[PDB]
Amino acid sequence: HLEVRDEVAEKCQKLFLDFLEEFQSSDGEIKYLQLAEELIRPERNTLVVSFVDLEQFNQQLSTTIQEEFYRVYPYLCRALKTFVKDRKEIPLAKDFYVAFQDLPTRHKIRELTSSRIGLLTRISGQVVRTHPVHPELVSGTFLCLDCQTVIRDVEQQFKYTQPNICRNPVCANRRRFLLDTNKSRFVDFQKVRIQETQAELPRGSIPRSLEVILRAEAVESAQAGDKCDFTGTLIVVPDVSKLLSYRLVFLACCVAPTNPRFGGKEQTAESIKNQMTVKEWEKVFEMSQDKNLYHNLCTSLFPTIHGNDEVKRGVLLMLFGGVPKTTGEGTSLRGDINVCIVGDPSTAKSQFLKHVEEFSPRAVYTSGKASSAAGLTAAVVRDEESHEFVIEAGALMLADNGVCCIDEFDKMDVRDQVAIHEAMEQQTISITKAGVKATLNARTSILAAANPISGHYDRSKSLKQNINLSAPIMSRFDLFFILVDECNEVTDYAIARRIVDLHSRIEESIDRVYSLDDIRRYLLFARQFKPKISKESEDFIVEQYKHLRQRDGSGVTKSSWRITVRQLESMIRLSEAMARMHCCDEVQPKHVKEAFRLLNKSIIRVETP
Amino acid sequence: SDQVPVGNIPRSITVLVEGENTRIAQPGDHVSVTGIFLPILRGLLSETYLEAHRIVKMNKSEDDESGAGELTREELRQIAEEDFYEKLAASIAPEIYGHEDVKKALLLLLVGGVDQSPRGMKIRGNINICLMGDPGVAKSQLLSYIDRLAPRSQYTTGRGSSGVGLTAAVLRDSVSGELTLEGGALVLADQGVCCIDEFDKMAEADRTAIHEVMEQQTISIAKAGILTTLNA
Amino acid sequence: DEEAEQKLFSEKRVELLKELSRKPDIYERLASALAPSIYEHEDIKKGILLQLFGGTRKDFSHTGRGKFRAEINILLCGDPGTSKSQLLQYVYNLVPRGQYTSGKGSSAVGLTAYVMKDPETRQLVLQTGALVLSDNGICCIDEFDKMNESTRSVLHEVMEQQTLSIAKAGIICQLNARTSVLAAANPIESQWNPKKTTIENIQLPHTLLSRFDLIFLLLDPQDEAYDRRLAHHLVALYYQLDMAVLKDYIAYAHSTIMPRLSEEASQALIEAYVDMRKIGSSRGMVSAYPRQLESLIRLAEAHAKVRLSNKVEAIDVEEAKRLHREALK
Ligand SMILES: [Zn+2]
């Protein structure tokens, strides 16, 4: 009559409860008795047990988890409700969840056969959508109706499930119960959809996708556009309309990024200077103290590009960024600088952009002929499920606080260069559409590459006649690098040598100081200062703005894209971005002199026969 | 659409062929059907279908007599004459004076050469013919005649036909949302002749859709529902 | 799919392949066995044979450069009747995983990737065009001239970087493919008039002519000897080497070969680019940008694979330089 001992489950619950207390770290000091400490303050209900340590402490167990992970999950969570009664301040009907991590062996979304249901797997993919968060009923408390008793602890399975038996010999309604909803047990529930990662696609195939279901404190870890790495169990799900047809669903329990740039755990100078491991911090200091740094980042970022020494500098000063300010009224000064390149064919334009976009993290790359207006900035899509118009993020948004690399910027249509200017001006993106009204932030820096009208750059006209951008856009850049391939026989030997070297030395011909992983660290560090201006530097700046206007003065010479005020607000920015580089906290004449020389070589003189 | 009041919409009927009459009729075809006319089971209004008992093809305007193409010895008499090639030429659209040579070529078009296949390199065995000429020389009469003298034929006008309606079109069904293929003129005229008058007035993007059918004699569709090559 | 199946070759066959690869002209003996119905056209079959091997597949993930295209794009321009479309129709029927497209019957998005309202779920979903369905093989694009400049500027991405970056309503992704175009066009005015300059009969831009690396100008007039020989050949088709040698030689030369450059070959590749500049500068025919210096590599290595040489030497540069020079004349 009485229930049956699911022995394979309870024995595992017991051994897991033992492991939770016996296992200790390098210095005694049982570790799952201190991580389980914060598990009492509200909003925390998931303990994260590593799986490799459960391999050390035991091995007849790991092979039970990794093979019955669905049978024995409802017990590895009760064996955490007992282990945590030693705090006495937890509400007695609260429930906890175990979340594994660091499984040994991975898998692919195409290896998820139907021979894997109920086991413990691990999956990597991208993230496409994210639905909203909901409550989900795990164990209802049916308030009986005729007996006025309480049928209790009834488990739902994908439906409402309406348990129909009462422990009262007089229960006039074995088909009627009004459940309460102030004692029952709810858990959060988010359902997102992941798409096969890029490096796994078999050639000539469209990527598959599946539904993952985050169901805990883990409920908003994954966002759209990320490359997380989920670890849960594959389950089958019926079609509840007729309760058949089944469909596969991934039931994740833990989710973590696929390759942490900093392997510790995943916002000012000190919060980051804490995570700096000893070698990291003794290297960042060494660099910040290095002299001639401004020439060992160029030589170490673009190691396979001979020449154009005045373009690499600008690209660097674009990566470091200026100081973003907010005026008291409510407006805001643009903090980051934009950069455009314009040149002859085959002059290494797309190579700067590819370098920047493969080096930098959170920087997107798009061409111009294969884009749209509602694809760059922001869209509006009808989700018929919610039957509502919602907002989709564009390339200028999912690259926020990063860099957007636009190649072939002058192939875009007339109306697609308008939406981009409306964003490059106010740093925001307005939306006014079917039923949507919003204003979104966009603090990206744009690196654009273009081609002169009719192939070659004609050096007897202004810029406005050599390129087909709009008039407003050409004002919002404030750094141009006109490249001209005056076929020099001495270069055509150098470039030849370098290319053939690279192709004879597949993985070599790239030896440079300050390895690429290190520069990311230095650049994440030194991008948290806000240098100021000393009075002498302010005087220097106003004098330089004096000495720049009059070069364009009448009579002697002529130049292109006449100098205006906006060039001044773009000289303090370059000086601030120069100061950030040397990790200082103030601007000096040493910086402004160079930030003026650069902006001086930028503008060329129109010519005439 | 001929036997309809001047501007009225044609009405349809449903035919439930079954048993042995199946696979007789091809779509886009003149046919004559014999069968009971019943209502559909499951207020008092009723929808009706024709329950076919006999299906006869009347393509030739009389009755399908293609299989009865038997030449007698008294006709072998003519076919064996010295100038059999020259009698037919004169007996093509006799209502039209002159044009003794054009009628000699419009017959070769109806007979057609032979087609090889050496080392796997197809060569077509059909003939294409254009009739550039001044106005009022009875070209749209010659074409209307060669339309009726062909087992499988089609007639199309350059100014009243789009380039996807000649070859093959992909069209959706608002009942199922599924895209299906639908043959054009050149597909429905597979083993026969197609006629396109007013050929200089066809839109220039709707005319390069014939370069494929004139040499390789396939139609290679790669739209967003289908990816195939029909035989034309 | 049959790379594991290459280890499933009879050792009786590897002897045959290695021994056929030793004859002094196995290049001209295999090439001349492509399409045994075209007349001589000796160079175009050389190019279309080197296209079936392709340069090495080097691994540049370390240098942060990205990836490197290894397949060869070929353009055929020339006055009518010169048997261009027959070569495309022959290749398309030879290679597996290929497509055949035309000029006016193909749009900008139909070639790369479109977005369709999925019927059931009423949601926008991505699909693949023609240049992505091939993905391992050849995408024959006939009637290359008669595509308005919109749908022609789309090939700029997929044919040089071997990628495709899509950013539309809800889809923000980045495909990739390993295709190789083989295009055919007519000169402007459809008649090769020798009054104008070579960069004016083609009428293609430079940012598109440089992504090709073998521009074959089928300059063929009414040579009374050529016409007679061709007619004498064509009539013969009315009376009445193997394949499985080529069909297996190719699988082998793909599976177990990786030509690496040398220092004697690398020293003939530098001058072969410093002269190309002075040559192509003046004439006004077709300029040379550094991208060509990579194409030579692509061609040179692809020649070494023909003879299973596993190492690029001098002659494998002189051959694939004479080929690059004697196609525009
Ligand atoms: Zn009851």
Numbering used by the authors:
A (entry chain 6): 15 to 257, 292 to 314, 320 to 662
B (entry chain 7): 241 to 282, 291 to 480
C (entry chain 4): 433 to 672, 682 to 770
Can I see the authors' text?
Unwinding of parental DNA in eukaryotic cells is performed by the 11-subunit Cdc45–MCM–GINS assembly or CMG. The six MCM proteins, MCM2–7, belong to the AAA+ family of ATPases and form a hetero-hexameric ring that translocates on single-strand DNA. In the absence of DNA substrate, MCM2–7 adopts predominantly an open spiral conformation; the co-factors Cdc45 and GINS—a hetero-tetramer of Psf1–3 and Sld5—bind to the MCM5-2 interface and lock MCM2–7 into the closed-ring conformation required for robust DNA unwinding. The 11-subunit assembly of the human CMG shows the familiar architecture first demonstrated for the yeast and Drosophila CMG: a two-tiered ring of MCM2–7 proteins, with the Cdc45 and GINS coactivators bound together to the N-tier portion of MCM2, MCM5 and MCM3, so that Cdc45 faces the MCM2-5 interface of ATPase domains.
We therefore decided to co-express AND-1 together with the components of the human CMG, and succeeded in purifying a 14-subunit CMG assembly which we refer to as CMGA. CryoEM analysis of CMGA using Warp for particle picking and CryoSparc for image reconstruction yielded a 6.77 Å map that was readily interpretable and permitted the unambiguous docking of the high-resolution structure of human CMG and the crystal structure of the AND-1 trimer that we reported earlier. The structure shows that the disk-shaped AND-1 trimer docks edge-on at a near perpendicular angle onto the leading face of the CMG. The CMG–AND-1 interface is formed by the B-domain of Psf2 and the helical portion of Cdc45 linking its two DHH domains, which together occupy the concave surface formed by blades 1 and 6 of the SepB β-propeller. The interface buries only 1087 Å2, a surprisingly small area for a constitutive interaction. AND-1 does not contact the MCM proteins and binds to the side of the CMG where Cdc45 and GINS are located. Because of the high interaction angle of the disk-like AND-1 trimer relative to the plane containing the leading edge of the CMG, the N-terminal WD repeat domains of AND-1, not visible in our structure, would be placed in the trajectory of the parental DNA.
